[PDB]
Ligand binder design. Structure first.
Ligand code: CL
Ligand code: NA
Length: 129
């Protein structure tokens, strides 16, 4: 499913992401935009053999099992395919674990390079929530 900007902001807010660990909603919407362009089915292969999955491009090296990432961890205890569902619950629950890892949202390269330090509130402007 390809989410609309405000549609995703509302979905994330309902799942408890607004201000989770100090990160306002605009941060999560911005990260999703540049990581997957709001597409829950986005997948991208990395050079190390791992693969990123879903709306927030969660990596198979440490967070989910996709059966083809040798010596990887499944910290979120879920098949990576689950992160491609139209229902973002799995992605949200796993992202919460990731952001608590210690490096905050810096775990998401697109967020660090394209959202961090910008006016992220702009990503939820006009939205009804
Ligand atoms: Cl932080
Ligand atoms: Na894994």
């Amino acid at each position: 499913k390809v989410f609309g900007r405000c549609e995703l902001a509302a979905a994330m807010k309902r799942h408890g992401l607004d201000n989770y660990r100090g990160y306002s909603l605009g941060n999560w919407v911005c990260a999703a935009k540049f990581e997957s362009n709001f597409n829950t089915q986005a997948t991208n292969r990395n050079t190390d053999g791992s693969t990123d999955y879903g709306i927030l491009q969660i990596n198979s090296r440490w967070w989910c099992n996709d059966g083809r990432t040798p010596g990887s961890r499944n910290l979120c205890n879920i098949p990576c395919s689950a992160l491609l569902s139209s229902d973002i619950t799995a992605s949200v629950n796993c992202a919460k674990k990731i952001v608590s890892d210690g490096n905050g949202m810096n775990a998401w390269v697109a967020w660090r390079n394209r959202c961090k330090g910008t006016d992220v509130q702009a990503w939820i402007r006009g939205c009804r929530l």
